Design an enzyme around this catalytic site. Structure first.
Site, mmCIF file in Angstrom:
data_model
loop_
_atom_site.group_PDB
_atom_site.id
_atom_site.type_symbol
_atom_site.label_atom_id
_atom_site.label_comp_id
_atom_site.label_asym_id
_atom_site.label_seq_id
_atom_site.Cartn_x
_atom_site.Cartn_y
_atom_site.Cartn_z
ATOM 1 N N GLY A 46 0.870 -1.154 0.000
ATOM 2 C CA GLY A 46 0.000 0.000 0.000
ATOM 3 C C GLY A 46 0.907 1.203 0.000
ATOM 4 N N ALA A 49 0.818 9.398 0.688
ATOM 5 C CA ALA A 49 1.524 10.655 0.499
ATOM 6 C C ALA A 49 2.885 10.759 1.170
ATOM 7 C CB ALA A 49 0.644 11.810 0.973
ATOM 8 N N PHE A 50 3.090 10.004 2.242
ATOM 9 C CA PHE A 50 4.337 10.095 2.991
ATOM 10 C C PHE A 50 5.347 9.000 2.740
ATOM 11 C CE2 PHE A 50 0.868 11.950 5.492
ATOM 12 C CZ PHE A 50 1.302 13.281 5.473
ATOM 13 N N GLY A 51 4.889 7.875 2.216
ATOM 14 C CA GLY A 51 5.800 6.776 1.978
ATOM 15 C C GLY A 51 4.992 5.560 1.641
ATOM 16 N N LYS A 52 5.471 4.392 2.053
ATOM 17 C CA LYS A 52 4.765 3.165 1.733
ATOM 18 C C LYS A 52 5.210 2.003 2.597
ATOM 19 C CE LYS A 52 8.293 2.023 -1.674
ATOM 20 N NZ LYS A 52 8.646 1.849 -3.103
ATOM 21 N N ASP A 162 -6.725 6.101 15.801
ATOM 22 C CA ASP A 162 -7.382 5.759 14.545
ATOM 23 C C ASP A 162 -7.739 4.278 14.522
ATOM 24 O OD1 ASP A 162 -6.497 6.246 10.968
ATOM 25 O OD2 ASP A 162 -8.457 6.014 11.959
ATOM 26 N N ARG A 166 -9.854 -0.889 9.069
ATOM 27 C CA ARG A 166 -8.791 -0.699 8.070
ATOM 28 C C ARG A 166 -7.386 -0.759 8.721
ATOM 29 N NH1 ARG A 166 -11.711 4.086 8.763
ATOM 30 N NH2 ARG A 166 -10.492 5.580 10.035
ATOM 31 N N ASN A 167 -7.315 -0.623 10.051
ATOM 32 C CA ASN A 167 -6.030 -0.677 10.775
ATOM 33 C C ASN A 167 -5.871 -1.971 11.587
ATOM 34 O OD1 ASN A 167 -5.722 2.886 11.400
ATOM 35 N ND2 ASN A 167 -4.572 1.576 9.997
ATOM 36 N N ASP A 180 -1.010 0.444 12.760
ATOM 37 C CA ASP A 180 -1.306 1.729 12.160
ATOM 38 C C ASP A 180 -0.730 1.538 10.769
ATOM 39 O OD1 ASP A 180 -1.701 5.049 12.865
ATOM 40 O OD2 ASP A 180 -0.648 4.512 11.032
#
Length: 298
Positions: A46, A49-52, A162, A166-167, A180
């Site tokens: 996945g 915007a910040f990395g993967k 969060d 999905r987490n 996370d």
């Protein structure tokens, strides 16, 4: 970028009396350092915007001289990732948490190496099985496992800002692990997060005190956990289906509006869900409480 899994330190008896532990000033324990050459990178799990987060095979990271599959967090081509690393090295491991296994931080970009979960995030897993209902017992088991993972986090003085399906990730024996996975997704392309200045808020999962006061405690997590329970027993339907996020959504929550019993839930499970949504945080059950109720239902 920031992990939503965070350690806190309570300062008073009131919900807002606590502060977040920032590991920036702490030192990283080098016993976790892994040779980056022992990593064989595979497919992207996945991206955002910040990395993967990348899949890979790791040579000898495990107690044995064997190679195993791992998940590697990394940034777009830093201190925030180091803090997350330091934080996970202090947590200790648990069966229902995606555990840290190692890190590469010295001779190249920073990589955090985690346990790999072959079947992806629990939300997609659930949706991918709507036409193949996986049993009710599995559903109850997922629920029980997440409660156990959250019980571990409460014990280690951490909160998840969060918490949502999905987490939560799924591995081999129908075992799920809380993490996370924000780095592995583009929040901009995810409508479950509402834009507000420098914040990207999962509004439909948020306890009232988080929505209206920016407060996040383990009790707020009990509320989010109730929303996650609804996700499990509806097989992955968006919470408050059909209701948009606008000023009326906030008023609904403030007034005590709660979701109806989802199809796969029994009335006992729904009663548990409802208590998780008590407006007053003191009235919500505790995770060790939830782990018993569910362990029993199981």
């Amino acid at each position: 970028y920031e992990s939503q899994l965070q350690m806190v330190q309570v300062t008073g008896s009131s919900d807002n009396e606590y502060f977040y532990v920032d590991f920036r000033e702490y030192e990283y324990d080098l016993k976790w350092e892994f040779p980056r050459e022992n990593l064989e990178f595979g497919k992207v799990l996945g991206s955002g915007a910040f990395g993967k987060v990348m899949n890979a095979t790791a040579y000898g990271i495990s107690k044995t001289g064997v190679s195993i599959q791992v998940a590697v967090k990394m940034l777009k081509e830093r201190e925030a990732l180091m803090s997350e690393l330091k934080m996970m090295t202090q947590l200790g491991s648990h069966e229902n948490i995606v555990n840290l296994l190692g890190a590469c931080t010295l001779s190249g970009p920073i990589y955090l190496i985690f346990e790999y979960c072959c079947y992806g995030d629990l939300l997609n897993y659930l949706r991918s099985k709507r036409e193949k209902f996986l049993t009710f017992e599995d559903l109850l088991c997922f629920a029980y496992q997440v409660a156990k993972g959250m019980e571990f986090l409460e014990f280690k003085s951490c909160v998840h800002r969060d918490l949502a399906a999905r987490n939560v990730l799924v591995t081999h024996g129908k075992v799920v692990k809380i993490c996370d996975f924000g780095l592995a997704r583009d929040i901009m392309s995810d409508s479950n997060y509402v834009v507000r200045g420098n914040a990207r808020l999962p509004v439909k999962w948020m306890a009232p005190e988080s929505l209206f006061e920016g407060i996040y405690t383990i009790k707020s997590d009990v509320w989010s956990y109730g929303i996650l329970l609804w996700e499990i027993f509806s097989l992955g339907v968006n919470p408050y289906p059909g209701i948009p996020v606008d000023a009326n959504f906030y008023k609904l929550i403030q007034n005590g509006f709660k979701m109806d019993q989802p199809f796969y839930a029994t009335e006992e499970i729904y009663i548990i869900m409802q208590s998780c949504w008590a407006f007053d945080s003191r009235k919500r059950p505790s995770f060790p409480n939830l782990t018993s109720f569910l362990g029993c239902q199981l």
